[PDB]
């Protein structure tokens, strides 16, 4: 019967759980027709991690493994195959009951970052190193992290080494152009295009009419081109971390929370925090929620599903 709590954190002290970014705004989009079923930042209110969700902020959209060889590919640039391990270096077992190695990206797009290597062999017995900008196309048929390997491309033409430990540090997107297939709500095919994704965290949606999902939104950097892409998560990484630590039993399917302004002690609006780990609000518009960034959600009480939220 441990009481349920959220951390006391300003919006500026929250991290996106789907890409390593600060949270920039709360956000609604009630006319979204896509199915919302992201796999990172998934955690039940009683602390069960789901999908590909792991606890490290540095693990979100990261890969660890080994380049096996250069490969041939139509598209621009140079291409490389790498095996991927678990984030802590232990081999990934594709029969593990997860959709893919924990931290694997959960959306279609060209993910821009840096590939770096530190050789295992040995110069003062000091290993050789290199790092280069890289792009991982998660929509591609060669993106098969559930099978233990992925592809990435570089602008660099040859300075990537086979058989050496490899790390991908995510930075942003390469492009949001038409042929870059950015869609934050389309899952990758974790095993390749003709195979079913498995062990997925469930989709989320409002049920009571008049309600919509409330997202923690971050704007994601672009390597070049035009656009203002954003990534919406259901709960910031710090809530994932806190809920996991607390392991508090959920006393209903819906926790009523209030967004409070500590400068005034007042509630700005209320929201439903649902057992599976997401928020709904009674809002009839899209766009940012304009609220003091010093404010924060506070747990009020457990309510039933038929509770009527005061409109925002």
């Amino acid at each position, epitope marked *: 019967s441990k009481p349920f709590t959220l951390p006391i954190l300003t919006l500026g002290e929250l991290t996106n759980s789907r890409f390593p970014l600060p949270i920039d705004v709360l956000y609604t989009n009630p006319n979204e027709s896509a199915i919302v079923q992201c796999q990172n930042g998934r955690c039940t209110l*009683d602390g069960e991690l789901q999908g590909t969700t792991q606890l490290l902020p540095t693990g979100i959209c990261a890969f660890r493994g080994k380049v096996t060889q250069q490969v041939q590919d139509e598209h621009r640039g140079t291409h490389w195959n790498m095996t991927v391990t678990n984030l802590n270096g232990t081999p990934f*077992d594709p029969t593990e009951d997860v959709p893919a190695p924990l931290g694997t990206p959960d959306f279609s797009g060209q993910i821009y970052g840096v590939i770096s290597q530190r050789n295992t062999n040995t110069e003062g017995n000091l290993p050789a190193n290199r790092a280069h900008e890289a792009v991982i196309a998660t929509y591609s048929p060669k993106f098969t992290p559930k099978l233990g390997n992925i592809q990435f491309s570089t602008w660099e033409t040859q300075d990537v080494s086979s058989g050496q430990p490899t790390k991908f540090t995510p930075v942003g997107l390469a492009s949001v152009d038409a042929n870059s297939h950015f869609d934050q709500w389309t899952l990758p095919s974790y095993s390749g295009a003709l195979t079913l994704n498995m062990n997925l965290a469930p989709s989320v949606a409002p049920v009571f009419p008049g309600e919509c999902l409330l997202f923690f939104r971050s704007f994601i950097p672009l390597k070049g081109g035009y656009g203002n892409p954003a990534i919406d998560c259901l709960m910031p990484q710090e809530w994932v971390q806190h809920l996991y630590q607390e392991s508090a039993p959920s006393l209903s399917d819906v926790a009523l929370v209030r967004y409070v302004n500590p400068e005034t002690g007042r509630t700005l609006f209320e929201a439903k925090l649902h057992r599976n780990g997401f928020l709904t609000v009674a809002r009839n518009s899209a766009g940012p929620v304009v609220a003091p960034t010093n404010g924060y959600f506070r747990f009020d009480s457990w309510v039933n599903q038929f509770y009527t939220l005061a409109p925002m």
Partner: nanobody, 126 residues
């Protein structure tokens, strides 16, 4: 399609050791919590040793603390109860239980688990 199968039990003298095995099918131990209970005739069941999905949190019964340990072989989807020094109090049927999900908490009551095996018998004699 979840099955849990225990083995490794036997007859042993006080001060001896066994290694129990719990193999699973339809479920990977690396993504769920599990626990060992024991059931001797004429005695209420007792929680022995439990662990969460990544092994980062456990519960060990005070009576067995310095004597029982656990290990896992993820490749074999099997976890082990190592009983390094057995006492006469330990005689019982030791069985395996799984609770679905990747969480921190380690449940100590059987009704909170989702699956159990039949067990394997352990007798400490002389």
């Amino acid at each position: 399609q979840v099955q849990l199968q225990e083995s490794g039990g036997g007859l042993v003298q006080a001060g001896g050791s066994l290694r129990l095995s719990c193999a699973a099918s339809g479920l990977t131990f690396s993504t769920n919590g599990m626990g060992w209970f024991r059931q001797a005739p004429g005695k209420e069941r007792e929680f022995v040793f439990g662990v969460n999905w990544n092994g980062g949190n456990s519960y060990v019964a005070d009576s067995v603390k310095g004597r029982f340990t656990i290990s896992r072989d993820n490749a074999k989807n099997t976890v082990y109860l190592q009983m390094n020094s057995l006492k006469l109090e330990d005689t019982a049927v030791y069985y395996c239980a799984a609770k679905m999900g990747r969480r921190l908490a380690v449940s100590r009551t059987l009704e909170e688990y989702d699956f159990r095996g039949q067990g394997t018998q352990v007798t400490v004699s002389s």
